[PDB]
Amino acid sequence: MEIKVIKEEQNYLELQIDGEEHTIGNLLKGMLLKVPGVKFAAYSLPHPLITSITIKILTDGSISAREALIKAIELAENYANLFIDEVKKI
Amino acid sequence: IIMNKSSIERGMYRSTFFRLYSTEEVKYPGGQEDKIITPEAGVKGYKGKDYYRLLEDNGVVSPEVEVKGGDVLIGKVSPPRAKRDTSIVTRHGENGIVDLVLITETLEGNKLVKVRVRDLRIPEIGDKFATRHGQ
Amino acid sequence: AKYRCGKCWKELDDDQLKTLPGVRCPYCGYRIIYMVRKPTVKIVKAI
Amino acid sequence: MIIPIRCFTCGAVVADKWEPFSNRVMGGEDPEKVLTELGVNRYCCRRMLLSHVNIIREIIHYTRPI
Amino acid sequence: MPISLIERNGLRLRLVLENYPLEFVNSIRRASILYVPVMAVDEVYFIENNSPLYDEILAHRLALVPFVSDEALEHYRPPEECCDGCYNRVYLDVEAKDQPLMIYSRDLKSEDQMITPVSGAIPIVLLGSKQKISLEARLRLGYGKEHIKYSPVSVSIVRYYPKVTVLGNCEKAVEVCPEGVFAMENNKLVVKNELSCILCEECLKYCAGSVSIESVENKFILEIESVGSLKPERILIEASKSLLRKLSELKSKLEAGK
Numbered sequence: 001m002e003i004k005v006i007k008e009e010q011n012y013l014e015l016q017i018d019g020e021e022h023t024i025g026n027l028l029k030g031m032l033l034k035v036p037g038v039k040f041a042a043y044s045l046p047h048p049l050i051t052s053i054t055i056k057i058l059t060d061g062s063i064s065a066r067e068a069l070i071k072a073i074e075l076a077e078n079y080a081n082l083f084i085d086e087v088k089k090i
Numbered sequence: 091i092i093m094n095k096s097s098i099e100r101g102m103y104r105s106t107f108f109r110l111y112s113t114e115e116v117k118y119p120g121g122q123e124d125k126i127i128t129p130e131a132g133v134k135g136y137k138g139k140d141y142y143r144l145l146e147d148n149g150v151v152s153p154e155v156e157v158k159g160g161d162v163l164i165g166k167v168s169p170p171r172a173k174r175d176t177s178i179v180t181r182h183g184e185n186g187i188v189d190l191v192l193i194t195e196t197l198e199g200n201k202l203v204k205v206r207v208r209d210l211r212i213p214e215i216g217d218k219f220a221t222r223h224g225q
Numbered sequence: 226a227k228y229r230c231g232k233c234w235k236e237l238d239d240d241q242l243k244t245l246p247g248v249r250c251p252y253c254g255y256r257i258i259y260m261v262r263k264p265t266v267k268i269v270k271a272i
Numbered sequence: 273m274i275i276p277i278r279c280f281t282c283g284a285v286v287a288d289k290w291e292p293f294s295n296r297v298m299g300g301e302d303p304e305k306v307l308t309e310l311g312v313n314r315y316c317c318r319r320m321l322l323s324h325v326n327i328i329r330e331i332i333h334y335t336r337p338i
Numbered sequence: 339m340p341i342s343l344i345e346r347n348g349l350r351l352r353l354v355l356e357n358y359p360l361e362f363v364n365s366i367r368r369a370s371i372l373y374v375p376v377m378a379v380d381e382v383y384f385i386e387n388n389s390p391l392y393d394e395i396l397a398h399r400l401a402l403v404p405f406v407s408d409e410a411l412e413h414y415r416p417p418e419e420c421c422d423g424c425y426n427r428v429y430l431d432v433e434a435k436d437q438p439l440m441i442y443s444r445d446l447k448s449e450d451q452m453i454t455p456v457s458g459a460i461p462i463v464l465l466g467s468k469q470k471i472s473l474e475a476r477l478r479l480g481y482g483k484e485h486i487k488y489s490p491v492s493v494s495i496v497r498y499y500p501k502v503t504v505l506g507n508c509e510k511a512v513e514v515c516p517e518g519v520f521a522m523e524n525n526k527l528v529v530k531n532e533l534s535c536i537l538c539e540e541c542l543k544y545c546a547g548s549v550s551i552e553s554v555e556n557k558f559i560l561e562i563e564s565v566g567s568l569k570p571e572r573i574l575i576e577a578s579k580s581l582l583r584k585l586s587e588l589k590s591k592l593e594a595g596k
């Protein structure tokens with residue numbers, strides 16, 4: 001993937017990701033919504049003919065938006081690893 | 091309407107389009123002049139060397155050959171009215187594959203050549219569909 | 226050029242050097258012949 | 273012309289169930305019972321077999337010479 | 339956060355997932371279709387074809403034939419890291435003598451013996467008298483995000499976990515449920531297949547006060563059905579590995595910018 005920043009502050013981040021679609025966007029939005037300190041989080045797919053998404057994060061300032069995104073990625077990685085561990089023993 | 095792309099990738103509503111091209115070796119009564127089917131040489135109405143790359147030694151393309159718009163399918167030179175180039179080319183902006191080549195004779199005895207070109211059509215945004223109820 | 230006398234999908238093959246009064250199958254006299262597909266290898270994308 | 277390899281809706285393979293199904297139905301068996309025995313449970317895959325027209329049998333008599 | 343098996347029947351696998359978010363389960367459901375590599379025909383080299391079917395039609399039919407790929411994910415290079423070790427060759431050379439002949443999937447010969455068609459009874463083409471075909475195809479790994487011929491499953495389902503409770507007694511519930519959740523055992527209404535409930539709520543418009551229908555918030559049901567190339571348990575692991583790869587790449591690109 002190729003990423004780029006549209007608008008970044010301490011409590012706001014608009015991130016565009018090229019080469020991604022609903023699979024990662026929905027997971028990241030759902031993981032962000034459970035990070036403490038995040039006030040608003042959404043993802044957008046500007047055109048269905050293009051494989052690109054936009055992430056929009058707003059926090060209260062206690063945590064950075066980039067830090068919240070990294071925490072959400074860590075949460076998703078923990079879930080994926082636990083799923084891999086548990087599928088091997090069914 | 092909204093249509094499934096995976097259904098189309100599995101072969102649903104795919105189509106083929108066919109087109110036909112024909113010649114005839116006209117034998118003029120006046121002066122015993124006649125046309126001949128052959129790869130055109132450096133003659134009055136030449137089009138370019140790379141437009142005749144697909145013709146065989148008898149002046150007609152072979153089956154299972156990809157053609158583009160402007161490519162020559164049958165080579166033909168006509169009696170003067172020097173000899174003039176009267177070849178038949180693929181129409182503008184219509185690619186395809188040569189499907190059938192037929193060589194026969196008319197009642198008079200003139201050579202008759204028919205070439206069929208096929209084009210594959212896969213459903214895309216902008217295509218029309220209808221039901222048996224007028225929708 | 227290599228042709229094929231067409232009475233069905235396939236019949237005896239004939240070549241261009243066989244010169245006759247007109248276009249006809251030498252073996253059976255039929256008046257319609259077809260060009261064969263050249264043995265050049267063709268690459269088709271499987272989409 | 274010939275039976276499709278996969279169902280159009282889902283990706284299940286239906287081409288290998290055409291000969292048993294058609295052979296048994298023209299033998300006098302119930303199409304629904306034959307389809308259930310063969311493992312074709314979704315109606316998307318059942319319409320694939322219940323509506324196929326075998327045209328290649330007629331076309332092999334008129335193949336292009338080339 | 340456990341995983342419970344419901345049923346394992348051939349190419350189908352059904353599971354119960356507890357304490358997982360719906361976003362993760364749906365991402366697994368999508369990744370098992372889009373990001374699992376499978377061997378499939380990429381292109382075909384034709385020498386001759388007298389069959390009623392054109393070259394493109396035969397190429398598409400061959401590309402839609404599944405191949406066994408379980409051992410090919412460690413001996414071949416995936417399309418993410420693009421010859422030997424990349425492609426495999428499969429041959430087909432047939433001819434009919436005097437009567438029509440049907441060509442099946444058992445007529446395809448592979449140079450590598452661990453990559454074979456899943457079923458040998460798939461009809462490829464019907465040949466007339468004296469017609470012949472001789473071709474050569476090349477197989478490579480690929481993802482269903484590029485073409486659906488590379489997908490390893492047919493259906494992929496995630497649905498809510500049902501909770502069916504019988505409050506009173508009514509004979510209409512057995513009549514109106516399309517899933518057969520209820521039955522009559524000794525003149526009373528009982529629940530036989532609770533997990534087969536699809537939350538239709540058709541029972542609530544007839545047995546309004548006799549039946550209670552809810553969904554468990556933290557539980558989900560996952561169904562996948564393999565097509566033959568890979569076993570159902572390998573697909574669920576490959577999907578999670580693809581998710582991990584994408585997440586790690588995104589995390590590295592993010593941390594390399596602050």
Ligand code: F3S
Pocket residue numbers: 514515516517519534535536537538539540541542551
């Ligand atoms: S009628 Fe049927 S499947 Fe579910 S909620 Fe009501 S039971």
Ligand SMILES: [Zn+2]
Pocket residue numbers: 230231232236237250252253254255
């Ligand atoms: Zn003949």
Ligand SMILES: [Zn+2]
Pocket residue numbers: 279280281282283284314316317
């Ligand atoms: Zn189906």
